[model samples]
Target: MHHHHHHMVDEILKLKKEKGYIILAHNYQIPELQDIADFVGDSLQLARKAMELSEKKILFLGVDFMAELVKILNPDKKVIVPDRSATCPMANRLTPEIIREYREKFPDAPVVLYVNSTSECKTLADVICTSANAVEVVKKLDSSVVIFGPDRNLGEYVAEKTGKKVITIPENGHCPVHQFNAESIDAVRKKYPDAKVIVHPECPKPVRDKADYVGSTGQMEKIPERDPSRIFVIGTEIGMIHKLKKKFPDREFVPLEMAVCVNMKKNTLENTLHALQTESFEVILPKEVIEKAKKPILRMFELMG
Candidate 1:
């Protein structure tokens, strides 16, 4: 690391100690932030970590939704995000109105909402699911008909695995970073013929179909640790490649697609320092929304357990 970067890390650590804060970063964030983060994982993992930790303050370095989730999970703790404007496109794509409409159309079917949605949207869901546990959650639903939302690709993937009739809303809702050309997999295969392909369900059907394993960001981070493959093809955000390389230095990790989510990269070292120093851009949701939205998220944890 450069001298300036080292100094910045020192300053951030100082602030963390002074504020009694736990810093969390998502896998999609730049390697620098991930390296400095106290905890680095997916949305579900980060939220659970915040809930488990006893820190009185949290500095979440990701998009708005993630900070909101941490704030939700640790309601009594002070949670601040580096960039207030940072938000996931997929989360914004689905709205409470869309979910309400779906409920009217299929009152009998239970709504299984992806965690990559707003708290308002989750308030209407029967239960919430993360990409890591969506398949498992959907598998246990007693209802034959299920309403899955926000990310069409992830919903379809879960439906296929659970053998349920899933009705998805916002037909076009998808993560731009995860939408890869299926043909790209062929190129990846040709380059590393011996590598095993591991992908996130947010990927398009054809791309996911060609994968050796499909999972969430947290699950994707674990595959290499468990799988005996020395060479693996990662099919998620480019930032994941950085994480994999650090985790297993002996293995070779390749990106099936080098796609990046711009929103996740909005937190720069400067802004992060400012956020902690000034304690600005605190994430606060309405009390009613927080109370109602938390039920689904807590239900997801119970189901996952």
Candidate 2:
């Protein structure tokens, strides 16, 4: 099996170079996919990196929305993914209709869509934010209240951080992978007493409360740089453990009882090679979707500045 993977990797690299396809993988992707990818990052990182790279073609490994994001940012570039069916369930849940309804219900509040949301949903949003900047983005908004969506836990997390009223559109929208039990934290604490716990903001409040830190995947990658924890209990998708390990080889990373994003793992080494060889699954979005969706995403950076 090891030799089998080696063979696939050889071909993947060969095809990638021959075809000039720069690969990007999200932090939640399987370790092999992440390791082989040119860059491993969250949606925000993927989008920003895609914008900077001069690569004419991209092989993206993550959910459909993220691939669309790369396409949205680089309209002329050819962006392909291993699997078209790979998509975020949470992203799909928040529709444009819901965004409109929420906007009407809270006319004074801005609609801030999480980056995990669909391209169409992004087209309707007043602004965009990732977990790394959600609190800051909401705080920068003049509105005393904001309508946030696609991830209820993230919305609540931002509301708490910004001290603003957050009307979470679609009610209980959340990431299934982050639905970890708070009790697991209690159990882990008993076992690894000195281990520092870091959880994603997408987690439920109870789990977030039990952890020592809450951060986006990008932020998590930086923890060992300063914290110097010998062992860290990570509370996000299982794939992140691999990402953390590769970055901080000397430090130990353990999953907070194990969570996985099924969509992210849909792209295997074989399919990725096939994607590069065939280039069949290119990410395509309507021109209107890209033009309108891009406004709020750009606004996020403008606000950060």
Candidate 3:
């Protein structure tokens, strides 16, 4: 590490202890920020950690939606983000009006939402599910027809898994990082013929169908560690490859496509330090929204159990 980076890490560590702040980072973050995080994982993992941990103040170094989820889960805790403007395009694309329309149209069909959605959209959902648990959540519902949003790809994937007739909005909301064509996987496979392919369910159906395994970013990260594969092809945000390679140094992890989430990249050592020093970019929500948002989220936890 550079002298400045080392100095910043030291200072951040000191402030964390003095202020009683716990830092939660996402897998898409840069290596430097990820290395210093008290806990590092995907949105669902980090949110659950923030809720369950005893820390009174938590600093979430990810997108705005994540910080919102943390605040909704832990209402009394201090949850802040380094960059207040770091919003997810996929999460923002779905609106409350759109959800209300869907609900009105399909009163009999249960409403399921991806965890990538905003808190308001989640409030409209009958149940909330992460990419890792969407299929299971959908299966647990009694309805044969389900209305899912905002990521059509994930909705489609879950529909297939549960053999249910799923209705989803247009493909307006999607993870740009996971929007690669199926053809992109061919080059990686040709180069490393022995490598196994694992993908995020957010990808298009064709891309996911070609993969040896389909899962969330968290699940993909753990595959290489447990499997005997010395080489693997990962299909998700490129930053995840960095974390996987660092953890399993002996393994070879290749990216299917070089895609990135700009929002996740917004957090850095400098801003992280400033956020800790000032705590300016705090995540605050109205009591009404927090209460409504908690319903689907808490229901999700119960179903997952």
Candidate 4:
């Protein structure tokens, strides 16, 4: 069975080279997928990477929102995903109607949508933010109150960091994968007395507060460089453990819990092999959606610049 899996992996690589498909995956993807991918990163990083790459054909291995963002950025390029069903449940929880209603109520506030949002919602957003830059994005906005959504915990994190009032849409929108107990930190400390604990801002307040550091997956990859911690308790999706270990093999990466995003796990080596062979499910968005959604995304870059 292991040799059979190796054959599939080799077949994927061979087909990828023969067909000229550059594989782009997300941090939450399973280890096998990540190892085989040419490049693996968070949503915003992958989108930006896709823009400058010379390869016109991309085999993306993440959820729907991520693949769509890459397509939006490079409309001329071909972007296909292994599994069409792979999607962010948290992103779907916030509706376009909720955004419209919130915008009407908070006339003075700007709607800041997370990058992990529907393309339609991005069209309605004043700006888009990633977990890495949520606080920075909100701080740069010229408003006392900001309307944010899709992930309430991240919105609250931004609010706390920027000292702005963040009104999250969809009431208690959150990532189920990030709902770790604060008490877990205490237990891990007992197990690994000197290990550093890092958590995503998407986690609830108590979990975020208990961690030694709070950062995005992209930032998490870079933490060990400066911290020199031998063991790190990470508080995001379990897939990230593979990424961290691959980057810093000398150290140990531990999960806060055995949390998994079922959607992200939908992409497998078998389907990925099939994706390259068939190339059928090319990411396509309406021209209007591409045009409208690009506005907030570009504004996000402009604000940072």
Candidate 5:
């Protein structure tokens, strides 16, 4: 006489093994979804995970561009996202057409793309890059002009680090979740003056400049453990606060006002349950696009070696 949602987790697991599926969650995903994910990391790490897996299907709990990256690496595997509409404002800021125009303007330059871009944008890039490796990738370039992508904060960071002529896209597109000013950080930091500030690389230069530490999600998680701090403020996404707080129950984790990403949290528990039950909305990309996009990604790996 009782029906409960507890069965959903069982259903997700049953279907995951039945479909030969792998679940990838982003760093900013809601707490419960992260708990359900088979692997939880950033875009580049997710792509690498998808590449290494032999699973027949992948269900990514992230943005559309992220799902596309999985599809790019594991073209043979069926990929699905909880919500197809999940997208990044910065990813859409730069389009294939705009990249094409950039190519024409800087024919001699090597194209550097941020992993946050769309597959079409990826195809236009000479090499795909992530916030963690942007500087390294750009430093390897021999060209005089280096064209970077829609994430201006990342572009500037790479440029500042490498001393290269970075041609950041003119678009004003930004991560709404990472765009908070010092005024907000000041407000939050006042409560925890002793807390260390670790900002995401995707954040604005001002925030990055103020931060005592700046790195990826994995790197941020390691900060407290290494230093054993009592309080901290994270500048990337709101989801991060959940993970950090859970990992170190004794310490305090705070979020700068702009840390919340609405789009990343758009996929609710109900939607994920529905997706696992039906395996509907499977990600489908053309074979040729995946093939073309793979080149840049492969280049990233090769360069890493």
Candidate 6:
């Protein structure tokens, strides 16, 4: 077991250099696997990095939507994800067909597509919003009628903050893996009453609704900078716990869920190493798709600016 583990790491390092690829790992990624990344951040940060770097290739250690976002921003670059089978149920729950139906009902509403959505949704959206900037994005929009897709909780949170009339797609499609009661903070407190509970907006509304603090992976990383000794109960994907522990070894961290997102956690060291060695599942975005997708992604940054 030890030999196999060492071999995978060694192979991944060798192939990374050989491919000249930048490995981008999301915060929810496995701790050991995330440690090997060239960049460790959220979807928006990784997408921006992919656009700015003129690197030979990008190996996104995340699910499909994330890899798609990278390819959408950088058309010429080679983009690949280690596990292509990984999927997002929330993103898949809001299909293009149903979105069009909502559009017909509320023709004036400006759609805010979460980055967790499919490329098809991205192409159809008015703009993209990450968990980090959903509120700011909503605030920037001039439209009175608003529609936010895929993440009902994120939409509700944004709507409450911006005081905008938002027609959220009624979907109870919460991530089963990260689904925790908002009161779990109290449960963790009961266990380690001194620990702080940090969470992501993607968790269930109840979990995020009462969160002591809610933000993106990058935002969560700031906790270590603020208090190195603070213990935490992470509420997003469990893979992110790896990042927190590695960055702040002195701090204790635990997950609110043990079930795990079998989808996002599907990527392993062996598969990534194989991707580096073979580059078989490299993402290729069509010219037209990238052209269509760039509008929303660019709109996001423009709103930020």
lDDT of 1 at 138: 87
Q: Residue by residue across 1-305, what tens digits does model 6's lDDT show?
A: 47888889988988888778888987777776778888888887888887778686988887888888888877788888777788887788888887798888888998888888888878888988888888999898999668888877778778778999878774664456666776677678688877777777767667776666788878888876875446787887777777777778888878876647777778888788888888868887767778887798889989985
Q: By the TM-score metric, which is better: model 2 or model 3? A: 2
Using all chains and alpha carbons, the TM-scores for the candidates as numbered come to: 0.97, 0.98, 0.97, 0.99, 0.92, 0.93
Q: State candidate 3's TM-score.
A: 0.97
The better-scoring model by TM-score among 1 and 4 is 4
Least accurate 10 contiguous residues by lDDT in model 4: 1-10
Clashing pairs counted in every model: 0, 0, 0, 0, 0, 3
Tens-digit per-residue lDDT, 112-209, candidate 2? 99999999999999899989999999999999899999999999999899899999978889989999999999999899999999999999999999
Output the lDDT of residue 279, model 6: 88
Q: Best candidate per lDDT, number?
A: 4
Per-residue error (Å), model 4, residue 257: 0.6
lDDT of 2 at 23: 89
Task: Give lDDT tens digits, candidate 3, residues 1-305.
Answer: 99989999999999998999999998999989989999989888888888788889998988888889888888899998889889888888899999888888889998888889898888888889989989999999999899998898998898899999889864566778799889888877787888899999999999999999999988887787678898888889988988889888999888888888898899999999999999768899988889998899888888986
Instruction: Give the per-residue lDDT of model 4 (tens digit) for 1-305.
Output: 38988999999999999999999999999999999998999988998888889989999999999999999999999999988998988999898899999889989999999999999999999999999999999999999899999899999999899999999978889999999999999999899999999999999999999899999999999999999889999999999999999999999999999899999999989999999999858999999999999999999999995
RMSD of candidates 1 onward, in order: 1.2, 0.9, 1.3, 0.9, 2.4, 1.9
Q: In candidate 4, which residue pairs clash?
A: none
Which is the better candidate, 4 or 6, if ranked by TM-score?
4
Model 4, position 61, has a per-residue lDDT of: 95
For lDDT, candidate 3 versus 4, the one ahead is 4
Better of 2 and 6 by TM-score: 2
Task: Give the CA lDDT, 0 to 100, for residue 185 in model 3.
Answer: 82
By descending TM-score, how would the candidates be arranged? 4, 2, 1, 3, 6, 5
Q: After aligning candidate 1 to the native by TM-score, how far in Å is the CA of 16 from where it should be? A: 1.4
Cα deviation in Å at residue 164, candidate 2?
0.7
